[PDB]
Design an enzyme around this catalytic site. Structure first.
Site, PDB file in Angstrom:
ATOM      1  N   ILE A  14     -14.726  12.026  23.166  1.00 39.12           N
ATOM      2  CA  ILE A  14     -15.768  13.085  23.100  1.00 39.12           C
ATOM      3  C   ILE A  14     -16.195  13.552  24.497  1.00 39.12           C
ATOM      4  CG2 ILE A  14     -16.679  12.257  20.828  1.00 39.12           C
ATOM      5  CD1 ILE A  14     -18.936  10.906  22.415  1.00 39.12           C
ATOM      6  N   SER A  16     -15.113  13.440  29.057  1.00 42.24           N
ATOM      7  CA  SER A  16     -14.287  13.074  30.155  1.00 42.24           C
ATOM      8  C   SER A  16     -15.189  12.781  31.380  1.00 42.24           C
ATOM      9  CB  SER A  16     -13.428  14.307  30.423  1.00 42.24           C
ATOM     10  OG  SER A  16     -12.433  13.964  31.333  1.00 42.24           O
ATOM     11  N   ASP A 127     -21.900  15.502  41.779  1.00 39.31           N
ATOM     12  CA  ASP A 127     -21.108  16.332  40.870  1.00 39.31           C
ATOM     13  C   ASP A 127     -21.929  17.140  39.875  1.00 39.31           C
ATOM     14  OD1 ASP A 127     -18.593  17.347  40.171  1.00 39.31           O
ATOM     15  OD2 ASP A 127     -18.131  15.673  38.796  1.00 39.31           O
TER      16      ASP A 127
END
Ligand SMILES: [Zn+2]
Length: 287
Positions: A14, A16, A127
């Site tokens: 579901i 990454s 990120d």
């Protein structure tokens, strides 16, 4: 019929993450769905427990997922977390890859506050991107969550507040598309850089795309990013987007950002536009 020891049964992928994927799970004792991350105990550099620790350090922050369990089980290190809703990238695709100004402003307000909270706990995320923001479930469906601390780093000592040293020659960490200009130039990331990425993410949501999308490759994004003036990037959109980006790029390495100033820019614009503060997002107005 894969089972994480006794307690959890594993399901489809579901998500990454920066280090490993996220799988759908069931907690056998609860009658309840969860999100599960797995790492082989033989991994050369284990980071799952490290990343869980950051989450737990953040726990109780608004919009921080909760960890149900972290430990070793069989040949895996395992991290089980509360299950959240779709990412902003997912919802962007359902909205024809264009958000209304009202949606972008509601999102900006929350997103600046998640980054602000993380910095207050002495970490930078590194990120900042649409896929790392997820909506809550049920009664929390109006709340934006921040996830994935695998690239997260501490920027100051917790007791002394000694800030990490200035460095250069760094390899890029995070996605090239939303990376700060200084990040492309090899400078050590700091608080300023999380906020600068967020600005590119907001313009991405206004535009549907960035000018450095769809063009060796890293030098080419960096070029186009450095070649495109903020005025050009933000043409046709309220001046607050350009002001946000100019301020972020003015910040020196160890400077503390003015989170309130940036949020207020957007709140004032929101007032002038006449929008209801009703947390009714573009996706809620979808069939
Ligand atoms: Zn652990």
């Amino acid at each position: 019929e894969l089972r994480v020891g006794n307690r959890y049964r594993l399901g489809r992928k579901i998500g990454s993450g920066s280090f490993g994927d996220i799988y759908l799970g069931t907690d056998i004792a609860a009658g309840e769905e969860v999100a599960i991350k797995l790492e082989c105990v033989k991994t050369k550099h284990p980071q799952l427990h490290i990343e869980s620790k950051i989450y737990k350090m953040m726990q109780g922050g608004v919009g921080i997922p909760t960890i149900r369990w972290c430990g070793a089980e069989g040949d895996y290190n395992v991290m089980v977390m509360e299950l959240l809703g779709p990412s902003l990238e997912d919802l962007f695709n359902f909205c024809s890859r264009k958000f209304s100004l009202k949606t972008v402003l509601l999102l900006a307000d929350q997103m600046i506050s998640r980054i602000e909270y993380i910095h207050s706990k002495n970490f930078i995320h590194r990120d900042v991107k649409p896929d790392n923001f997820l909506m809550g479930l049920g009664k929390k469906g109006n709340l934006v969550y921040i996830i994935d601390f695998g690239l997260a780093k501490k920027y100051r000592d917790a007791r002394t507040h000694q800030h990490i040293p200035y460095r250069e020659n760094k390899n890029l960490t995070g996605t090239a598309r939303y990376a700060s200009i200084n990040t492309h130039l090899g400078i050590e990331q700091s608080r300023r850089d999380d906020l600068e990425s967020l600005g590119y993410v907001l313009m991405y949501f206004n535009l549907g795309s960035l000018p450095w999308q769809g063009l060796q490759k890293y030098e080419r994004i960096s070029e186009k990013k450095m070649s495109t003036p903020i005025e050009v990037l933000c043409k046709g959109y309220p001046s607050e987007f350009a002001t946000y980006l100019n301020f972020c790029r003015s910040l020196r390495f160890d400077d503390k950002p003015d989170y309130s100033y940036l949020r207020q820019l957007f709140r004032n614009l929101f007032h002038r536009q006449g929008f209801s503060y009703d947390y009714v997002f573009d996706w809620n107005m979808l069939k």
